[PDB]
Amino acid sequence: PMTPFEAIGGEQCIEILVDTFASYVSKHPDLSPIFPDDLTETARKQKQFLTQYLGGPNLYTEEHGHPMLRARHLPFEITPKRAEAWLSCMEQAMDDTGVHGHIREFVFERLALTAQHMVNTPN
Amino acid sequence: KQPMTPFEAIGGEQCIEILVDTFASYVSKHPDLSPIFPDDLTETARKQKQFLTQYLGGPNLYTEEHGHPMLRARHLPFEITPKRAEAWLSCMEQAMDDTGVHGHIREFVFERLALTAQHMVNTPNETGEI
Ligand code: HEM
Ligand code: HEM
Ligand SMILES: [C-]#N
Numbered sequence: 528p529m530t531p532f533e534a535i536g537g538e539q540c541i542e543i544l545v546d547t548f549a550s551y552v553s554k555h556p557d558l559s560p561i562f563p564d565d566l567t568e569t570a571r572k573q574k575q576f577l578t579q580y581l582g583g584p585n586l587y588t589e590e591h592g593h594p595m596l597r598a599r600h601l602p603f604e605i606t607p608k609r610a611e612a613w614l615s616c617m618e619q620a621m622d623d624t625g626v627h628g629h630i631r632e633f634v635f636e637r638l639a640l641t642a643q644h645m646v647n648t649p650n
Numbered sequence: 651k652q653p654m655t656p657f658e659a660i661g662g663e664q665c666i667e668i669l670v671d672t673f674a675s676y677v678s679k680h681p682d683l684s685p686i687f688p689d690d691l692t693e694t695a696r697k698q699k700q701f702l703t704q705y706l707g708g709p710n711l712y713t714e715e716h717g718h719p720m721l722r723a724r725h726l727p728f729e730i731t732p733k734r735a736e737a738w739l740s741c742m743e744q745a746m747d748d749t750g751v752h753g754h755i756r757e758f759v760f761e762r763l764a765l766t767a768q769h770m771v772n773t774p775n776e777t778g779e780i
């Protein structure tokens with residue numbers, strides 16, 4: 528024991544985490560313009576990626592191949608301000624789904640680092 | 651008579667401490683690598699030492715603290731190109747040279763590490779690399 532995926536609560540917790548996150552993303556002025564109007568598909572892939580990243584089944588790469596995550600974000604203007612907005616929505620999502628304690632810090636530190644890596648545009 | 655574990659054969663903790671500290675120095679200077687690593691590699695180095703210790707047959711310091719390495723999953727968000735894997739291995743080679751790691755243990759460790767690096771690659775090659 529115990530993968531971050533099991534510690535965070537498994538599929539059930541990822542489901543609601545990402546559903547709540549997508550809701551906040553869709554309502555954030557800094558993010559809603561660059562995401563799809565319908566985030567269903569986006570959220571489906573976010574669940575895949577977070578699942579596989581945190582030690583669950585290899586959902587994302589089994590369907591979409593190599594993650595190449597920064598490259599998939601290149602077509603979008605991802606500014607430091609937008610990275611902040613993203614993490615701000617993940618923070619609220621984790622608060623709303625009960626993700627606390629060491630797993631919260633573990634996951635958020637790694638997504639904050641990842642979000643920094645996605646930045647491809649100055650403010 | 652017990653053969654040495656690979657971790658013993660390389661010189662144990664004192665070697666792994668020196669090798670990783672040296673490696674992380676090269677990493678932080680490598681233009682292909684430093685952008686994606688944290689600015690302060692101290693936590694990364696601490697984890698690398700723990701990983702490599704158990705990776706080579708020492709105690710399970712990494713798994714006991716962090717859980718299963720699952721390194722391909724843990725590297726999923728990071729832009730790991732074939733080039734950056736070679737840079738990684740290049741810094742390890744230089745680090746091994748600086749720390750005195752030679753012989754069968756060096757080739758055993760490097761060849762295993764070269765397999766792991768290739769498995770971390772999660773971004774296609776760039777133009778000219780086909
Ligand atoms: C730094 C701020 C970020 C912004 C502004 C951003 C924005 C976006 C946008 C607009 C898309 C397109 C969605 C679609 O076409 O369906 C996308 C895709 C995606 N993003 Fe993010 N993102 C950010 C960071 C992250 C982070 C930290 C992760 C960590 C897991 C992540 C994982 C993904 C995944 C898995 C996809 C699906 C890619 C695909 O297969 O098409 N992103 N992102
Ligand atoms: C192939 C080129 C590689 C690149 C570019 C690379 C890059 C990175 C980066 C940017 C991180 C994030 C640092 C952090 O969050 O602390 C990381 C974490 C890590 N890497 Fe690598 N890596 C590579 C290969 C390897 C190899 C070959 C090994 C082991 C033999 C390894 C073991 C680790 C470990 C244990 C961690 C810490 C994960 C954690 O517990 O958070 N990596 N790597
Ligand atoms: C990406 N959210």
Ligand SMILES: [C-]#N
Binds near residue numbers: 698
């Ligand atoms: C990884 N270093």
